[PDB]
From Swiss-Prot, chains A, B, C, D, E:
The modification Omega-N-methylarginine is found at residue 77. This is Microtubule-associated protein tau. There is a cross-link at residues 9, 26, 39, 45, 49, 59, 71, 75, 81, 97, 103, 113 (Glycyl lysine isopeptide (Lys-Gly) (interchain with G-Cter in ubiquitin)). It comes from Homo sapiens. Promotes microtubule assembly and stability, and might be involved in the establishment and maintenance of neuronal polarity. The C-terminus binds axonal microtubules while the N-terminus binds neural plasma membrane components, suggesting that tau functions as a linker protein between both. Axonal polarity is predetermined by TAU/MAPT localization (in the neuronal cell) in the domain of the cell body defined by the centrosome. The short isoforms allow plasticity of the cytoskeleton whereas the longer isoforms may preferentially play a role in its stabilization. Interacts with MARK1, MARK2, MARK3 and MARK4. Interacts with PSMC2 through SQSTM1. Interacts with SQSTM1 when polyubiquitinated. Interacts with FKBP4. Binds to CSNK1D. Interacts with SGK1. Interacts with PIN1. Interacts with LRRK2. Interacts with LRP1, leading to endocytosis; this interaction is reduced in the presence of LRPAP1/RAP.
Length: 115, 115, 115, 115, 115
């Protein structure tokens, strides 16, 4: 008799992974200014295969953000008067039940009964 | 008799991993200023294979953020008067039940009964 | 008889790992200033394989943030009057039950009964 | 009879590891100043394999942050008057139960009964 | 009879390790100043393998932060008047139960009963 359960070469990478973003970006120059936010997310997969005489050239590119200003001149007065930007009055209440569950199970059961 | 449970070459990397971001970015220059935020996330996989005479060139690129200003001139007065930026009045209350659960189990059971 | 449970070559790296970020960035130059934040996260995997006469060149690139200013001139007065930036009045209350659970179990059970 | 439980070559590095960041960065130059924050996180894996006549060149790059200013001139008066930056009045209360649990178990049970 | 439990070549490095950061960085130059924070975290793994005639060149790069100023001139008066930066009034209360638990167990049980 033979009872076999064979699992091999399973790819379960990046399961239930939180790699996002949540930003509150505000920018009030009142003049000549540059603001840059650079938050890339990469979850790709690359596979290459060769045999005997081979040659693999894996040189991928990358992101490029460039800001250039050959000339910029300001004259007379530059002013910026600010009283407030964000006025928030949040008054919550009550009993809030927040439950989160993440599960990942691998259950294997084998049994052999004979005489 | 033979009861076998064979598990081999399982990839379970970066499971339930929190690698995100949560920022509150504010920038009030009132003049000539540069603000840069650089938070990249990389979770990629790269595989290369060769046999006998081979050659692998793994030279990937990278992010590039550049800011250039050949000339910038300011004249007369530059002013920036600020009273407040964020006015928040948060008054929560009550009993809040926050429960989080992350699980990852590998259960294997083998049994053989005979005479 | 033979009861066997064979587990080999399992990759479970970076499981339930908290490598994120949470920042509160504020910048009020009132003039010519540069602010840079550099928080990259790298969780990638790279694999290369060769046999007999081989050559592997693993020279990946890196992030590059550059700020250049050939000329910048300020004239007359530069002023920056600030009263307040953040005004927060937080008044919570009540009994809050916060429970977090992270689990990772490997249970293997083998049994053989015979005469 | 033979009851065997064989576990070999298991990779469980960096499990439930807290290597993140939590910063409160504020910068109020009132003039010409540079502020740089450099907090990179690296959790990658690199594998190379060769046999007989081989050559491995593992020279990865690194992060590079550069700030350059060929010329910067200030004239007349530069002033910066500050009353306050952060005004926080936090008044919590009540009995808060905060419980955290991290577990990692390896349970193996083998038994053989015969006559 | 033979009851065997064989565990070999298990990698469990950096499990439940707290190597993060928590900073409160404030910088109020009121002039020409540079502030640099350099807190990198490295938890990577590198593996190289060769046989018989071989050559391994493991020369990875490193982080590089550079600030340069060819010329910077200040004229007339430079002033910086500060009353306060952080005004915090924290009044907590009540009985707070904070419990943390980190566990890592390796339980192996073997038993053989015969006549």
């Amino acid at each position: 008799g033979k009872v076999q359960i064979i699992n091999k070469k399973l790819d379960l990478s990046n399961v239930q992974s939180k790699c996002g973003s949540k930003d509150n970006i505000k920018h009030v120059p009142g003049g000549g200014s540059v603001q840059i936010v650079y938050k890339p997310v990469d979850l790709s997969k690359v596979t290459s295969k060769c045999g005997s005489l081979g040659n693999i050239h894996h040189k991928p590119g990358g992101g490029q953000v460039e800001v250039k200003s050959e000339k910029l001149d300001f004259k007379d007065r530059v002013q910026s008067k600010i009283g407030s930007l964000d006025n928030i009055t949040h008054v919550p209440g009550g009993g809030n039940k927040k439950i989160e569950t993440h599960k990942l199970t691998f259950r294997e059961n084998a049994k052999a009964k004979t005489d």
